[PDB]
Design a protein around this ligand. Structure first.
Ligand SMILES: Nc1ncnc2c1ncn2[C@@H]1O[C@H](COP(=O)(O)OP(=O)(O)O)[C@@H](O)[C@H]1O
Ligand SMILES: Nc1ncnc2c1ncn2[C@@H]1O[C@H](COP(=O)(O)OP(=O)(O)O)[C@@H](O)[C@H]1O
Ligand SMILES: Nc1ncnc2c1ncn2[C@@H]1O[C@H](COP(=O)(O)OP(=O)(O)O)[C@@H](O)[C@H]1O
Ligand SMILES: [Mg+2]
Ligand SMILES: [Mg+2]
Ligand SMILES: [Mg+2]
Lengths: 524, 524, 524
């Protein structure tokens, strides 16, 4: 299509108005005194969130150029989310900030490219700075503090999270789902368990709800379905002999097997029942050895050097007992040596450090957690639906933040850390003048977070900022209590990693953005 | 698409006008002196209802922003309905109320977020308060009162309902359908019965209409059709022997079986006939044991350890007699021990407390009712169709209300309860001032219901409210009689549960809504 | 879509304008001096009717709100028609009436809901009232008068109708079809006969036109066709033996059977021929036992304990003779005891009182009429088509009216009955004042029918009405003769049932309608 090109100032301005719109719409939601925004939806009802990135995405401008600018800054708010799922709003604030000043300096007649470098440098510096102040977040107390501070000051949250982490361990998995009631609720799975119910409902051991509890069973693992392939009685009878209950796992099972199986377990011939493995081919099969090895079983290489009956009763794995309903199965404890356990674990180390990261290390550590650790789930409380969302939302942020503080430590919130490291680079200089401004520009912008927070409190951003800058170390203003003091003792912690990503991602784009001299796009 | 963002006051205002329109359109229908609204329909003729939620849903505004606010509030009216199918209008009124005030305070320059909290707390407070006033609704009288009150003061209703409940019991099922005549009618099913007619019309016992009355039959249950699988004569002849009638149930039956069956029963060889089981696989099957077990029969596990003929005459169940037409079948009474009954029932307790609730516990309790209790249906009378609707509509609310009153008691109507609990929290305070206002705001809104009611009577909302606030306990204004007194002795009861849901759901949204600082949506 | 809500007076007004348009367009056709309206049609040529309900349906307004009003009143006009196929126009007038007044009183500042009750009660009252005055319409004279009066005063009609009923009986069926000439014509079927011609055209007995007259035949009924299934000669020869003609009925007959049959009836071996049974499966079959039992035959349960040849010549039914063409068969008389006749009739009593009514009791009563009574059809005379329509139309109204007068008696026309019972409720009062007005309103409206009729004669509606009200009993104005007197002796009768439905249906909606406070619809 025919284009519309714009150069210099004109373009820039447009670009800026664009940024501001986006920015302004995300600022409103910063800090404890942060406010909400409503995203309309033709879909169902409008959405009410305080999640910066959530907002960003919805912003699109009619002015093709004002729009481009917005479409750009939008990615910082975005990347910031992919990085550590929080700090999004904050990051955005900084760009808005950097850009404003930057442009003003380009308008000042400076070479933009050096401004960029000056900023870049200024940032690389600021980063080491943070890494310096970053201090280990390890105790449950600290962990609940970031949770809480992340979930717009909700202790119940940090509290809950703190606990989960304290249970499932370090590699234990944690997820949030909408709860039933209005109270938040924490459930923690113990041992090995997945999402497969029994195909033989008739095979319900003791409790109802389809509760099966095969006491001291032999576990069986295969690689096929058993319609009429019922052949395998040697294996069967083998246990009928030892008089032990039996659990099975494979592609599937047809009535032919079940039917007979039924009356057998009935007549008190052999108390048994079975449930399908995990899910997809590579999936399920991927997850069995682990199971076998766990209970000390010998998975059946139906595809390799094994067959149906082709397998002795001793191949079977053994566990205290099991618990099954119409949807899930759980092994109380497959007696399997730790030489085996940590072994099947050690080999997970390569799986872990993977270049796939997302979706890979997810379902990955899951088993990892089930192969020794513990799995946890959180249910969010909310009367309405428009509440259940927002709530559950923040809950995750925090869930993330903690994850980050742990791996990368923390620093002082209230955007003090930055304002602090800023003073530390008061003497940073670069190759030429422009560059020095470029730096100065950046430092100057690092007061953004802080004073937006303040402003979201209807108070003098500049006045606070001063008194705060007059202080040292972790002296900081507490927006919530409206009084200064030590940000850490007050439990106002920001996972070091977010603060860093926010600054980086922010600059990464801001920088470029301010080096626009021309812009092309379609006609109105 | 290109968006249109609005911040602060502008946005709010718009949002509010939006709310108002909706609200205002729902108010009109509040109380005995509430009026109706007409909802247009391209479909057929317009609809005339006084059901708040019915109205809500139809409201959509041209102004994108005004619309959003409307689209939000709409959910309280909604959720309120999913909760206890009544109080919808009332709920709405409170939001309208809360928001108005709220915004006024934000306009006053207060932190919205604290306002929210102030409100939330004031509410959590207000709830215990109600649970205090809630008093058990257990006698048929009270129950008749809520139904009546619910059905805009129609005694006939509460009366009818009260009856139904008094019959089918507590776990007895109750449903409402359109009636033939103009009078309302109550039918109550006794014992075991379902929606299945006979495949062998020839096999009609005594009365007409397809009336079968197998005196002292042997009930038979299967898991497959019987085209030429007619093999089973043993079982058959086994009764030709005993000379007792026989009832059958299964996936189906082809004439092959029927044909011969006809002349057998004819010649006086064997008085018999059969009808299809419930409906879907897991369905029908899920419902048979009960049947069997009830009548003392042995369901045929055509899929498990059994086969056609594979079964003895004693396996069959026995019942006083049965009654069948071309659409329904009924068992007079299958002689089956209570140990069995309450048993088959007890195991329903898990089915009962289910995380499925909607649709689950529905068809669930149904059987639960047929499994010892009773099933009832109500036919609403109406001359027209636009009448049958409205009518049958209100009849259900009541139906629900009562259901709610029973499980959660009641409190004083006329919106006195609230107005009362408000005085009780006159000393409630929060962490800061804004929050205290946030509380005051809410308490203030709790007068809404009452004074909208009054206003729907062309009377001083503020003057009544006063004299009402001057009183104590259940002193309250009777809009209908236009004179004060004891709301309970006057039988003006609100199922505690609705009053509570209305307040919660209302606030849950209003709360958020008043913390809007920006709004985004598409362009006009 | 974006809506447009309207409250109070505004809404009401619009609504009313809507009603009026509709109403006014239907009024014009009320009474002997009623005029016509033309309904356009893209289809073919415009339609010219005086049938109120025909009109109503065609009315749709551009003003969404004016339209809603009209879409609602439209239902009274409608329902009135489903109820008893006449009085439509009349009904409408009352609504128009009720509403007008009603609204005026709401405008007066009265509680609408009481208004409604006032009206409702006033009506329930008015109904017993009518049931009082209703007097049995039994003599043919009376019956001709309602037909006549119904068919806008056409004696020829009431005359013809009276006859029919006098013939076919009470349960005899009567239908109207376009006739051939210009004179109306009445045909009356005697005995048993349906719409099936002979497959064996060659088997014509005596007259032409395919006229068959098997003297003292043996009727034969089956449940299948006969291509090569010609096997059955035993039964055949058994008659060749007896030497009697033969009639056959079944799913069909192939030439194979026919061919041979031809020459057989030809060479004088066996005078026979056959014709297909009724129509659909459950249709035809449903209609055979009846045929059998009548002539005294044994239907062939080709599907049950019976086969082809499998049946003795005695099973056959017998009849005096038959008459068939290429489209119709008829049994002079199948000697079949009345024990069987009325038996097969008595069991029709449940078929009769069926919760189906529409479509059921139709084809049902049909056979019923053929199983003892008589069947009649009327052919309407008209030069044109636009005439044949109108004509035939009114003819049915009367056909229904009579039906109604018969079952529910009659009362004095000219809208006197109502105006009369109104005076009777001059002292009716309700729980409060608003309600008394509500009542008064209604009574006042009952003068509508009468004075619209008067107005349709260019005369003082108020002057007549007065003199008419001064009178007693059935004193009434005769619009046609323009002179007062006894409405009954003049034969100006209205089937009690319609008069009643028109009032009920009318109020039923009107009532609700005047309680509108808001209205929602889409934008223009
Ligand atoms: N009570 C408080 N007083 C002062 N600063 C706070 C307080 N609570 C949180 N903060 C700071 O304000 C920031 C608010 O971040 P937030 O608004 O959630 O944006 P993001 O989406 O970027 O986290 C926190 O990261 C922290 O630095
Ligand atoms: N006769 C009466 N006098 C006073 N208050 C009444 C009377 N009848 C009902 N009410 C009160 O007014 C409310 C009206 O409820 P309604 O108009 O149906 O709204 P919702 O659909 O929210 O219940 C009742 O719930 C009760 O609190
Ligand atoms: N000559 C007459 N004088 C007085 N009243 C009459 C006369 N003819 C008919 N009527 C009355 O007017 C009615 C006319 O019916 P009609 O105009 O077709 O309206 P609808 O279709 O509502 O019956 C009759 O039912 C009867 O009540
Ligand atoms: Mg955050
Ligand atoms: Mg209600
Ligand atoms: Mg008429």
């Amino acid at each position: 299509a025919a284009k519309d090109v714009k150069f210099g100032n004109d373009a820039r301005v447009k670009m800026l108005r664009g940024v501001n719109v986006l920015a302004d719409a995300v600022k409103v939601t910063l800090g404890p005194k942060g406010r909400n925004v409503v995203l309309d939806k033709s879909f169902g009802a409008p959405t009410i969130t305080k999640d910066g990135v959530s907002v960003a995405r919805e912003i699109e401008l009619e002015d093709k150029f004002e729009n481009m600018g917005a479409q750009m800054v939008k990615e910082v708010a975005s990347k910031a989310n992919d990085a550590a799922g929080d700090g999004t709003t904050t990051a955005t604030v900084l760009a808005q900030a950097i850009i404003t000043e930057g442009l003003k300096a380009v308008a000042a007649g400076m070479n933009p490219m050096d401004l960029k470098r000056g900023i870049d440098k200024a940032v690389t510096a600021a980063v080491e700075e943070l890494k310096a102040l970053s201090v280990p977040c390890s105790d449950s107390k600290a962990i609940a503090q970031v949770g809480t501070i992340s979930a717009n000051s909700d202790e119940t949250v940090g509290k809950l999270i703190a606990e989960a982490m304290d249970k499932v361990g370090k590699e234990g998995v944690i997820t949030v789902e909408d709860g039933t009631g209005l109270q938040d609720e924490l459930d923690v799975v113990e041992g090995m368990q997945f999402d497969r119910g029994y195909l033989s409902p008739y095979f319900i051991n003791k409790p109802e709800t389809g509760a099966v509890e095969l006491e001291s069973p032999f576990i069986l693992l295969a690689d096929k379905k058993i319609s009429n392939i019922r052949e395998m009685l040697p294996v069967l009878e083998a246990v009928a002999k030892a008089g032990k209950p039996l659990l099975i796992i494979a592609e599937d099972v047809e009535g032919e097997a079940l039917a007979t199986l039924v009356v057998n377990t009935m007549r008190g011939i052999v108390k048994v029942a079975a449930v399908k493995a995990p899910g997809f081919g590579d999936r399920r099969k991927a997850m069995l050895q682990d199971i076998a090895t766990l209970t000390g079983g010998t998975v059946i290489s139906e595809e390799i050097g094994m067959e149906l009956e082709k397998a002795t009763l001793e191949d079977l794995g053994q566990a205290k007992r099991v618990v099954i309903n119409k949807d899930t199965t759980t092994i109380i404890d497959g007696v399997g040596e730790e030489a085996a356990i940590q072994g099947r674990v050690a080999q997970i180390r390569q799986q872990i450090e993977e270049a796939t990261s997302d979706y890979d290390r997810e379902k990955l550590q899951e088993r990892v957690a089930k192969l020794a650790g513990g799995v946890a789930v959180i249910k969010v409380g909310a009367a309405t639906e428009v509440e259940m969302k927002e709530k559950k939302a923040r809950v995750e942020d925090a869930l993330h933040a903690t994850r980050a503080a742990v791996e990368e430590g923390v620093v002082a919130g209230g955007g003090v850390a930055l304002i602090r490291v800023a003073s530390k680079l008061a003497d940073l200089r670069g190759q030429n003048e422009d560059q020095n401004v470029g730096i100065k520009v950046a430092l100057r912008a690092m007061e953004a977070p802080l004073r937006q927070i303040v402003l979201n409190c209807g108070e003098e951003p500049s006045v606070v900022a001063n008194t705060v800058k007059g202080g040292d170390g972790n002296y900081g203003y507490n927006a919530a209590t409206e009084e200064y003091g030590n940000m850490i003792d007050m439990g106002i912690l920001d996972p070091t990693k977010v603060t860093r990503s926010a600054l980086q991602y922010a600059a990464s784009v801001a920088g470029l953005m301010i080096t626009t001299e021309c812009m092309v796009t379609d006609l109105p």
